[PDB]
Design a protein around this ligand. Structure first.
Ligand SMILES: *[C@@H]1O[C@H](CO)[C@@H](O[C@@H]2O[C@H](CO)[C@@H](O)[C@H](O)[C@H]2NC(C)=O)[C@H](O)[C@H]1NC(C)=O
Ligand SMILES: *[C@@H]1O[C@H](CO)[C@@H](O[C@@H]2O[C@H](CO)[C@@H](O)[C@H](O)[C@H]2NC(C)=O)[C@H](O)[C@H]1NC(C)=O
Ligand SMILES: *[C@@H]1O[C@H](CO)[C@@H](O[C@@H]2O[C@H](CO)[C@@H](O)[C@H](O)[C@H]2NC(C)=O)[C@H](O)[C@H]1NC(C)=O
Ligand SMILES: *[C@@H]1O[C@H](CO)[C@@H](O[C@@H]2O[C@H](CO)[C@@H](O)[C@H](O)[C@H]2NC(C)=O)[C@H](O)[C@H]1NC(C)=O
Ligand SMILES: *[C@@H]1O[C@H](CO)[C@@H](O[C@@H]2O[C@H](CO)[C@@H](O)[C@H](O)[C@H]2NC(C)=O)[C@H](O)[C@H]1NC(C)=O
Ligand SMILES: *[C@@H]1O[C@H](CO)[C@@H](O[C@@H]2O[C@H](CO)[C@@H](O)[C@H](O)[C@H]2NC(C)=O)[C@H](O)[C@H]1NC(C)=O
Ligand SMILES: *[C@@H]1O[C@H](CO)[C@@H](O[C@@H]2O[C@H](CO)[C@@H](O)[C@H](O)[C@H]2NC(C)=O)[C@H](O)[C@H]1NC(C)=O
Ligand SMILES: *[C@@H]1O[C@H](CO)[C@@H](O[C@@H]2O[C@H](CO)[C@@H](O)[C@H](O)[C@H]2NC(C)=O)[C@H](O)[C@H]1NC(C)=O
Ligand SMILES: *[C@@H]1O[C@H](CO)[C@@H](O[C@@H]2O[C@H](CO)[C@@H](O)[C@H](O)[C@H]2NC(C)=O)[C@H](O)[C@H]1NC(C)=O
Ligand SMILES: *[C@@H]1O[C@H](CO)[C@@H](O)[C@H](O)[C@H]1NC(C)=O
Ligand SMILES: *[C@@H]1O[C@H](CO)[C@@H](O)[C@H](O)[C@H]1NC(C)=O
Ligand SMILES: *[C@@H]1O[C@H](CO)[C@@H](O)[C@H](O)[C@H]1NC(C)=O
Ligand SMILES: *[C@@H]1O[C@H](CO)[C@@H](O)[C@H](O)[C@H]1NC(C)=O
Lengths: 171, 98, 344, 195, 47
């Protein structure tokens, strides 16, 4: 009826009064419409949806990349499918091979998963928290040191930043 | 996409956010009501006797098709100004209370 | 409704004289809780999708304001990585995952309500489970598929309303199970090694003797502990029971306010898409249809300016809130090193 | 000398990037016909060039405002960092700290300051125990129906004999009446041993 | 009693100056023909 737009049209359950033609949501966008020939109500849903991130090892080393689709669950709305599809609680990762080891985080993907440029290709793994250890606790056992080490460590702290001034008229 | 949003030809190791996943429209559809007649262009602009201005006439325009190109060879105007709408989108809209 | 003058507290008087002293004859072992926020939600914004949508005319008009969106996203990513850094300073103090032995002989002290429960899918403690159910988040997971809200489910579910307008929430780097593992390692180290695992290698010591060391640290001789060991263990167990009780009963307001504030900010962003900002309408499709390019550009310019300043306000207030959360996380890290890894 | 001071370089980088972003934002039209005042002032006459100049003025003013706001926020963070550095200077360099992990990892012995571009570096000298050894231990010693507790140490046993040592360094000594003190009898302490 | 609390007076001064700056900023045209609503609403018609 003259109102233009873009989106996906689906059958609706809303039911208009006879003096109504369009339906609006809280952001005041038209989200429902009555078809002027069949008199049926339709819902209008937008077309773009879902975040995308790109994981690179740096283009000074390679132009291989992996892509994380943060709203896809494959078990699609993807640009490519290639190989090495790996599902994560942060989304579907495409272009990186899943391994069973665990290292320190290199590139944080999220939800406990990191990625790195190892063997060349891109691998994705679960980050390790640290080495496992156990204390030999008993009710009558103690451990006493017999030597020592003198350690020297550095700690860096910022104290100032640059002082600037601006001339409004000149800018 | 990242090279261009960074405004640089080199990208450093890491992970970067890009634009949301876009889908392009495949078709174009138009849905207008079932109207067959043409609007009374010849009994509004071609009337025989008009009214004086202190008792001005008001005609109701109901369900009809607005083809104002049929006037192109019948009458010139020399004043024609629209206010809420541009003249290039007149034959692309539906009008409520005419 | 009544109105009164508030009271400062109960009145008290000390029986001061020049040769009188008061000495305690018994003691109580008290256990208290302290809650501290450490992170907030990491968000990201797509300018083009928020300001224009799928409008190509608007998106071409917006190319005079690309620096402003790169700036907004730079600020938001700074906040987002700062949150993970916060969590790491608080919880990742030690990089050895200590386990507690099956020797649950701690001199009579019962640590069963704060030690991991292997009967859960996670390895959370009874106390940690009680805490987990008193804070209601807004995102149960972070995978909401397109097909899952397709229809009128959008604009009735607030998260799909946010997502259709370019507002994304990213998941934290450390899962909740990893944080539970970290706290479990801290507890195991502190009950089997005292304060030595925070200064170098963990050196075991019987619990009772560690408690005697800690009694020495406050000016009480060790025989006061060794001669009252059962009473002290019973008081500790009763105090821990009181905690669980109180909790499971009835709050974590300081942790719920963070979630509430972030959700309210995002929803305010979404409703501010109904403002005209001085234009003829707030919908780009009502302007682009019924108006032709050169004279629709004025209206689209008004809308663009308004929505840009909306995004700017959001980012500024997020930066201010992130500074406050950063201060809180620094305090929590200091408390972790000085109260948990030592005696203050 | 080998290979960094990333936290001190990020400050310089951030300030430089902010100023350069200000400079490039002078290429925005903000909804005007051009971003150059000389293309507007030439080809347009005052009353109808004023609208374009007004658009440019508003845009550039808000650019300056954004810069100043983000500078204020960053200055608050640097202020917090400088307050922490002053506290560390008074408590780790001008004294010896008992606060755990405040002046390094280990037991703090001393600290030395060094100046760096826009910041400070602390060299923390700490004491780290090493080469530990296992011993049997006991809370008290029972001699004559009396319980003896160590004064400033702990009771250890090399397997057959009992000594009293200090907690942080193995230096065994013979248990005497100058190492211990008496309190009560031998019926209340749990793991008391005879010696 | 002789002669200060500058750090406590600066807070009062800053808050007062902020409010007064708000009040004087009501004299800006912001690109309009005047800064008074009554000079615009009289001599000009609604649209
Ligand atoms: C991807 O989809 C799967 C299933 O459609 C989600 O997980 C199911 O989860 C339940 C537990 O809640 C399991 O009992 C089922 O066996 C799972 N089935 C499958 C096929 O996985 C999963 O959560 C989705 N992706 C993510 C990471 O959320
Ligand atoms: C202290 O004595 C304990 C008891 O034997 C030693 O610890 C065990 O070491 C073995 C081999 O490394 C492990 O498999 C066990 O899990 C350990 N714990 C037990 C048995 O509870 C420990 O090496 C001794 N410490 C020193 C410094 O000599
Ligand atoms: C305590 O540790 C030091 C090392 O820090 C030991 O001294 C080293 O001894 C070895 C073998 O005799 C030498 O090769 C090194 O040169 C020594 N180091 C230094 C810095 O001189 C010392 O022997 C240990 N003491 C005990 C009692 O074990
Ligand atoms: C508009 O015209 C269409 C046809 O051009 C009508 O569609 C008919 O609808 C009836 C339902 O009662 C069907 O039985 C016919 O098969 C339809 N025709 C076609 C060609 O599909 C429609 O009814 C008209 N609008 C109204 C309000 O009557
Ligand atoms: C310590 O001795 C003082 C002196 O009698 C006691 O305090 C007084 O108590 C009475 C009754 O409670 C009050 O009316 C007085 O005001 C108190 N102060 C005085 C007289 O100076 C006190 O109860 C004693 N404390 C203990 C623990 O026994
Ligand atoms: C010190 O206080 C404790 C209470 O905290 C006293 O122990 C209580 O004694 C009463 C009466 O004998 C019992 O009903 C309670 O069950 C005891 N409490 C616990 C936790 O066991 C203790 O007697 C006091 N000591 C002195 C010397 O007064
Ligand atoms: C530590 O305290 C807990 C209480 O929280 C004790 O566990 C209960 O044990 C009894 C006996 O098996 C069970 O019937 C209960 O169901 C347990 N859970 C409760 C009461 O919540 C535990 O036994 C104590 N530990 C020791 C060594 O006594
Ligand atoms: C525990 O230490 C004592 C040291 O007092 C050891 O006993 C002495 O050992 C030396 C050398 O073997 C002998 O000359 C002495 O006669 C021993 N007795 C005394 C009273 O000095 C004892 O061997 C050590 N035990 C273990 C298991 O190492
Ligand atoms: C430590 O020494 C005492 C005294 O030498 C031992 O005491 C005996 O205790 C039992 C049970 O109370 C009595 O029936 C005996 O009459 C006591 N004998 C004496 C001589 O006092 C005590 O058993 C010793 N402890 C160990 C573990 O050997
Ligand atoms: C990346 O390329 C630049 C220029 O080609 C070079 O100076 C730099 O060293 C390279 N990076 C590394 C890590 O070598
Ligand atoms: C990796 O871990 C999986 C977990 O089931 C296991 O099946 C597999 O054998 C491991 N090795 C691989 C597949 O690289
Ligand atoms: C009206 O139409 C007739 C033809 O039917 C024409 O002759 C006459 O000039 C027209 N008059 C006006 C005012 O349009
Ligand atoms: C220590 O535990 C053992 C069990 O192996 C027990 O026989 C002994 O009485 C306990 N001693 C103390 C002091 O707890």
């Amino acid at each position: 009826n003259g109102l233009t737009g873009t989106g996906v049209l689906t059958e609706s359950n809303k039911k208009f009064l006879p003096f109504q033609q369009f339906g609006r949501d809280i952001a005041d966008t038209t989200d429902a419409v009555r078809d002027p020939q069949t008199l049926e109500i339709l819902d209008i849903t937008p077309c773009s949806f879902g975040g995308v991130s790109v994981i690179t090892p740096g283009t000074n080393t390679s132009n291989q990349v992996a892509v994380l689709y943060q709203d896809v669950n494959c078990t699609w709305r993807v640009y490519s499918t290639g190989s090495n599809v790996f599902q994560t609680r942060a989304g579907c990762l495409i272009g990186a091979e899943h391994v069973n080891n665990s290292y320190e985080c290199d590139i944080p993907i999220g939800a406990g998963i990191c990625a790195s440029y190892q063997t060349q290709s891109i691998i994705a793994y679960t980050m390790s928290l640290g080495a496992e250890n156990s204390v030999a606790y008993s009710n009558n056992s103690i451990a006493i040191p017999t030597n020592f080490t003198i350690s020297v460590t550095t700690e860096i702290l910022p104290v100032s930043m640059t002082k600037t001034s601006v001339d409004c008229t000149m800018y | 996409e990242t090279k261009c949003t960074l405004k640089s030809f080199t990208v450093e190791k890491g992970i970067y956010q890009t634009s949301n996943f876009r889908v392009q429209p495949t078709e174009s559809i138009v849905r207008f009501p079932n109207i067959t007649n043409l609007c009374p262009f010849g009994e509004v602009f071609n009337a025989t006797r008009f009214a004086s201005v202190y008792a001005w006439n008001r005609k109701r325009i109901s369900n009809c098709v607005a083809d104002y190109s049929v006037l192109y060879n019948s009458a010139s105007f020399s004043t024609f100004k629209c206010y809420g709408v541009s003249p290039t989108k007149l034959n692309d809209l539906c009008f409520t209370n005419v | 409704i009544i109105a009164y003058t508030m009271s400062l507290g109960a009145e008290n008087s000390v029986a001061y004289s020049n040769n009188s002293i008061a000495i305690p004859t018994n003691f109580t072992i008290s256990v208290t809780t302290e809650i501290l926020p450490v992170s907030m939600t990491k968000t990201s914004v797509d300018c083009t999708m928020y300001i224009c949508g799928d409008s190509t005319e608007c998106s071409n008009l917006l190319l005079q304001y690309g620096s402003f969106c790169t700036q907004l996203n730079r600020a938001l990513t700074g906040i987002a990585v700062e949150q993970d850094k916060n969590t790491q300073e608080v919880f990742a103090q030690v990089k050895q995952i200590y386990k507690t032995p099956p020797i649950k002989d701690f001199g009579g002290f019962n640590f069963s309500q704060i030690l991991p429960d292997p009967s859960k899918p996670s390895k959370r403690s009874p106390i940690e489970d009680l805490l987990f159910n008193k804070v209601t988040l807004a995102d149960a997971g972070f995978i909401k598929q397109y097909g899952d809200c397709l229809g009128d489910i959008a604009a009735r579910d607030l998260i799909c309303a946010q997502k259709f307008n370019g507002l994304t929430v990213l998941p934290p780097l450390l899962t909740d199970e990893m944080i539970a593992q970290y706290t479990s390692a801290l507890l195991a180290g502190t009950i089997t090694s005292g304060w030595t695992f925070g200064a170098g290698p963990a050196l075991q010591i019987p619990f009772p003797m560690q408690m005697a060391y800690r009694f020495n640290g406050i000016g009480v001789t060790q025989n006061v502990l060794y001669e009252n060991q059962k009473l002290i263990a019973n008081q500790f167990n009763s105090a821990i029971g009181k905690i669980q009780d109180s909790l499971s009963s009835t709050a974590l307001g300081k942790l719920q306010d963070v979630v509430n504030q972030n959700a309210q900010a995002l929803n305010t962003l979404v409703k501010q898409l109904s403002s005209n900002f001085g234009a003829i309408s707030s919908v780009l499709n009502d302007i682009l249809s019924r108006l032709d390019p050169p004279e629709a550009e004025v209206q689209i310019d008004r809308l663009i300016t308004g929505r840009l300043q909306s995004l700017q306000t959001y980012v500024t207030q997020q930066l201010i809130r992130a500074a406050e959360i950063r201060a809180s996380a620094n305090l929590a890290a200091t408390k972790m090193s000085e109260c948990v890894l030592g005696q203050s | 000398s080998s290979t960094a001071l990333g936290k001190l370089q990020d400050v310089v980088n951030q300030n430089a990037q902010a100023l350069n972003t200000l400079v490039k934002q002078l290429s925005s039209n903000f909804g005007a016909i051009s971003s150059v005042l000389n293309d507007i002032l030439s080809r347009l006459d005052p009353p109808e060039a004023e609208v374009q100049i007004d658009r440019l003025i508003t845009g550039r003013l808000q650019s300056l405002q954004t810069y100043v706001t983000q500078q204020l926020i960053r200055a608050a963070e640097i202020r917090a960092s400088a307050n922490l550095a002053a506290t560390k200077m008074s408590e780790c360099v001008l004294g010896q700290s008992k606060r755990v992990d405040f002046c390094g990892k280990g037991y703090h012995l001393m600290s030395f300051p060094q100046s760096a571009p826009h910041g400070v570096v602390f060299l923390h000298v700490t004491y780290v125990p090493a080469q530990e050894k296992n011993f049997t231990t006991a809370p008290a010693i029972c001699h004559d129906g009396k319980a003896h507790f160590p004064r400033e140490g702990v009771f250890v046993s090399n397997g057959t004999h009992w000594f009293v040592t200090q907690r942080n360094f193995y230096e065994p000594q013979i248990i005497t009446t100058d190492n211990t003190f008496v309190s009560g009898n031998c019926d209340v302490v749990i793991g008391i041993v005879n010696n």
